[PDB]
Ligand binder design. Sequence first.
Ligand SMILES: CC(=O)N[C@@H]1[C@H](O[C@H]2[C@@H](O)[C@@H](CO)O[C@H](O)[C@@H]2NC(C)=O)O[C@H](C(=O)O)[C@@H](O[C@H]2O[C@H](CO)[C@H](O)[C@H](O)[C@H]2NC(C)=O)[C@@H]1NC(C)=O
Lengths: 210, 232
Amino acid sequence: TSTDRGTFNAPFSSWSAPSGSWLRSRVKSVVGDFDGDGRDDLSVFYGQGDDTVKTYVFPAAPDGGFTTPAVWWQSASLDWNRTTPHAGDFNGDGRDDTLVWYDYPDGSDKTSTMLSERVSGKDRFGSAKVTLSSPPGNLDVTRMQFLTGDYDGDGRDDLATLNHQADGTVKMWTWTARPDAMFNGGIAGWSAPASSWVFGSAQFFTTYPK
Amino acid sequence: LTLRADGDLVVVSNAGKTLWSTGTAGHLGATARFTDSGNLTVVDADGTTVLWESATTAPGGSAVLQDRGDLVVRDAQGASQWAAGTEVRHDYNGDGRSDMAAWYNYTDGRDAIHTFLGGTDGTLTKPLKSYDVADGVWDTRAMKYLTGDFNGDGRGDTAVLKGYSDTSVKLWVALGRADGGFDAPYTAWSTPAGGFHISYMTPHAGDFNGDGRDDVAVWYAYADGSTKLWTF
Ligand SMILES: CC(=O)N[C@@H]1[C@H](O[C@H]2[C@@H](O)[C@@H](CO)O[C@H](O)[C@@H]2NC(C)=O)O[C@H](C(=O)O)[C@@H](O[C@H]2O[C@H](CO)[C@H](O)[C@H](O)[C@H]2NC(C)=O)[C@@H]1NC(C)=O
């Protein structure tokens, strides 16, 4: 936890698991405020044996710790090894939700957005829909770094990347979010040749790893 | 389908109302004929002057008035070329007026189908229920509802496309009754699990084949982003 001096307190544990349960190698984690209770919390996209995806959420306790996780979303239609989850408020609800960037065998990729909602008193992520897509070979998911945020300040989170092009050029793209969580076309920003900015030699400051 | 003494060729429903006409009234002695060219026309008393035509071409074809409702001109290959459109959609009792029905899920787990019959002033009367079944008979979590005349009876039927917990799919059909109610659903089609999935299917009812019986088309969205239209 943080103090008013800008320093951190001693760490304390909360949620835990016995060995043989949660495997670190199968955990892709993101964070955000997924139920709008004013506290950020964790969610995990777990690789369920057959490489299906099951999403857990770990609500934050009032004391800063974490509570027992629950499943908010699951699908067997997509390969866990090809999913890179991201978190943010992509429709301006006041409560964060997630999208998954998917790298298809076809060489194309897409983003599927699952908006957070409460139905019959139960918190879960809604049905996934495609909000972004590209032609095959247009983007390589392993050659670009991702970071989300509200770049135009319109109250809806969106995502931007620094991608490494075939000719070594690095280019910024931003896809802003529409009121329905559909993305707009990418808008080009700053770019440079490899002689100035080396892609593989820089790491962005993020809110969650990878 | 009748040709009146006043020369006006008309189609009327079981309600006694006229659904379609050529408007060739006052031409007394006028006659309606189906030509060798495959078209249906109305000719004047002189046997020469044409007052109305479907303006179709289909040698070796025929004009058939279907039990489903409307009048359709078909070619030698059995393909429709023209139709008057004199039909009443989802008319469940066959009285010549469209009706509507709903699947009502009770909080106690049981369900039934309720039918609202059309009145003479276009209003909808109080519903009657039919096919009231006990709790546990249907697992009503993942099902889609269709209407249409799936038997060629002349009265509307209903159908339900449902997924099952084993990922299998079945399509149920229930025939319309003369009293406005429905009989028990029966399986009209089914597939083993791994074939079709209820989450991807988006069924539509209507007569797509033009064979005089309603059928089902599905806009199937694949997980890989591809799309296909399937017809049953
Ligand atoms: C959780 C999820 O994404 N489920 C899939 C699907 O979700 C949609 C969908 O059903 C539409 C149209 O019916 O209605 C809502 O939008 C649903 N959204 C939510 C958040 O529930 O729902 C189907 C479904 O059949 O309801 C899931 O398939 C599952 O349910 C069937 C029928 O009971 C059966 O139990 C299956 O075993 C079960 N299938 C699997 C593979 O677990 C959809 N599931 C997937 C994985 O796509």
